[PDB]
Amino acid sequence: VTQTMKGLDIQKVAGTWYSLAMAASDISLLDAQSAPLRVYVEELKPTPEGDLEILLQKWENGECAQKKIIAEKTKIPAVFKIDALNENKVLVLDTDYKKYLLFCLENSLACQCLVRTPEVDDEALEKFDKALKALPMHIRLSFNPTQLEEQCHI
Amino acid sequence: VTQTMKGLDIQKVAGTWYSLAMAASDISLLDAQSAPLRVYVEELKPTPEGDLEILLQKWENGECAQKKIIAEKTKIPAVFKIDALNENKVLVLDTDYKKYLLFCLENSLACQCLVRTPEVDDEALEKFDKALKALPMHIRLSFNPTQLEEQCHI
Numbered sequence: 073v074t075q076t077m078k079g080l081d082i083q084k085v086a087g088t089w090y091s092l093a094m095a096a097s098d099i100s101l102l103d104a105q106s107a108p109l110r111v112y113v114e115e116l117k118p119t120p121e122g123d124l125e126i127l128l129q130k131w132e133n134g135e136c137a138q139k140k141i142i143a144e145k146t147k148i149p150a151v152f153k154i155d156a157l158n159e160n161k162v163l164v165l166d167t168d169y170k171k172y173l174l175f176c177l178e179n180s181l182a183c184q185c186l187v188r189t190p191e192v193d194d195e196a197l198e199k200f201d202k203a204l205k206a207l208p209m210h211i212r213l214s215f216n217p218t219q220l221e222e223q224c225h226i
Numbered sequence: 227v228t229q230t231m232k233g234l235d236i237q238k239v240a241g242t243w244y245s246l247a248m249a250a251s252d253i254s255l256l257d258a259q260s261a262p263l264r265v266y267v268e269e270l271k272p273t274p275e276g277d278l279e280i281l282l283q284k285w286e287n288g289e290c291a292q293k294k295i296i297a298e299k300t301k302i303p304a305v306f307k308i309d310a311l312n313e314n315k316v317l318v319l320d321t322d323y324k325k326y327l328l329f330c331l332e333n334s335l336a337c338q339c340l341v342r343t344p345e346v347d348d349e350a351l352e353k354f355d356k357a358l359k360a361l362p363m364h365i366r367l368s369f370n371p372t373q374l375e376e377q378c379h380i
């Protein structure tokens with residue numbers, strides 16, 4: 073992944089987002105509702121110090137669970153780390169702050185098209201697809217407005 | 227689906243095919259290995275009378291099962307019917323006979339990009355994507371050469 077947002081202002085990604093589309097390098101990362109990177113973003117909360125708290129929903133053990141994870145800043149504004157047994161990088165590819173944000177998680181790769189509202193933004197989906205066409209994605213999902221307003225997009 | 231192959235010669239689709247990519251209108255048609263339209267084409271056998279026998283693999287009850295289904299001709303060369311409780315149409319969108327064939331199944335919609343060999347044909351995938359961009363697809367899968375040579379693409 074060699075697309076990152078230049079001049080990212082992480083404070084300006086604060087607030088509500090919708091996981092309109094997702095893609096991953098391996099089918100098994102996204103196939104089932106309980107697949108590992110089937111995560112539905114709810115809210116981004118940048119801290120003062122420029123870390124990024126993330127609220128998301130994740131289907132585990134037969135229900136839609138709310139999770140809170142912190143992505144810690146690096147020396148690159150568009151790149152954050154998530155603390156685990158494995159170090160995973162969050163990369164912000166592109167955003168206009170007021171409509172869409174594209175990001176990928178890499179250790180194997182999953183990316184999403186976030187939008188501010190429960191609407192299919194064809195423009196943002198086009199940019200999503202263009203950013204992905206370089207990458208080895210083998211599964212892509214997208215959600216309708218009804219699904220976007222349900223917990224875990226059921 | 228308003229793309230069909232003009233001047234289709236069904237005899238010339240005979241032989242070996244590989245389900246390189248699949249897409250569907252609803253995630254639940256393709257998500258799990260045991261999802262309803264997660265079918266992997268093996269061989270097409272047009273009959274003299276211009277019906278189309280299809281050999282495919284389908285994961286059911288914890289194993290990769292071989293299935294044989296017959297798609298019966300209609301008055302349109304590019305359109306076939308599969309006998310069930312519901313009448314389902316097979317539509318041949320496009321083929322060059324020697325490398326790729328695009329088709330959709332509709333009752334809700336699933337389409338595939340078939341190829342003659344266990345190779346990622348970017349050209350055929352591009353035509354697949356272009357044919358789909360009109361249609362309301364919410365899941366897309368594609369397989370690597372290793373997977374293509376395994377039963378049920380495991």
Ligand SMILES: CCCCCCCCCCCCCC(=O)O
Nearest residue numbers: 109111126130139162164175177
């Ligand atoms: C700028 C937006 C970045 C959003 C990143 C979401 C990262 C998801 C982390 C991987 C999934 C964690 C699920 C879990 O808690 O086990």
Ligand SMILES: CCCCCCCCCCCCCC(=O)O
Nearest residue numbers: 263265280284293316318329331
């Ligand atoms: C020209 C190529 C057309 C290939 C059509 C494959 C159609 C698959 C039929 C639907 C799945 C049947 C699975 C089953 O036997 O229950």
